[PDB]
Specification:
Largest sheet of chain A: 3 strands, antiparallel
Shape of chain A: globular
Subcellular location (chains A, B, C, D): Secreted
Keywords (chains A, B, C, D): Disulfide bond, Ion channel impairing toxin, Neurotoxin, Potassium channel impairing toxin, Secreted, Signal, Toxin, Voltage-gated potassium channel impairing toxin
GO molecular function (chains A, B, C, D): ion channel inhibitor activity; potassium channel regulator activity; toxin activity
Strand content of chain A: 35-45%
CATH class of chain A: Alpha Beta
Number of helices of chain A: 1
Distance between the termini of chain A: 6 Å
Protein name (chains A, B, C, D): Potassium channel toxin gamma-KTx 2.2
Oligomer: homotetramer
Organism (chains A, B, C, D): Olivierus martensii
Radius of gyration of chain A: 8 Å
CATH architecture of chain A: 2-Layer Sandwich
């Protein structure tokens, strides 16, 4: 499933290292100012 | 070959985590406002 | 425990590659303008 | 000991994914607007 985070963002490119590091996930999206990982 | 994305960018440095995570590619380029991976 | 860096930042998303590269750590936080890793 | 790049940057945090992807290197520095890796 998806993993929402508390990491703030303004663009989805910013979410890829977070999503990889924290959850081993290879897809990230910046959704309402927060990284969401899937 | 190259793998285009829907990830918006304003500089090529932004594309490296996306290109690595999604496709295992070691180069990203911001091309017409979108990340391209190779 | 935590490992400080002198890598400058304005948001915590920026610190994830730094913390991974330097210390193998999967959490980064931008704390007073510098990456801190844990 | 460094590996220079043609990747444009404004801050050293931006160079960590570049340096990892291209050269397997765990340190990046933004030097005169370009990523340098070591």
């Amino acid at each position: 499933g998806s993993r929402p985070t508390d990491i703030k963002c303004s663009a989805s490119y910013q979410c890829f290292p977070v999503c990889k590091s924290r959850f081993g996930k290879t897809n990230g999206r910046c959704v309402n100012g927060l990284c969401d990982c899937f």
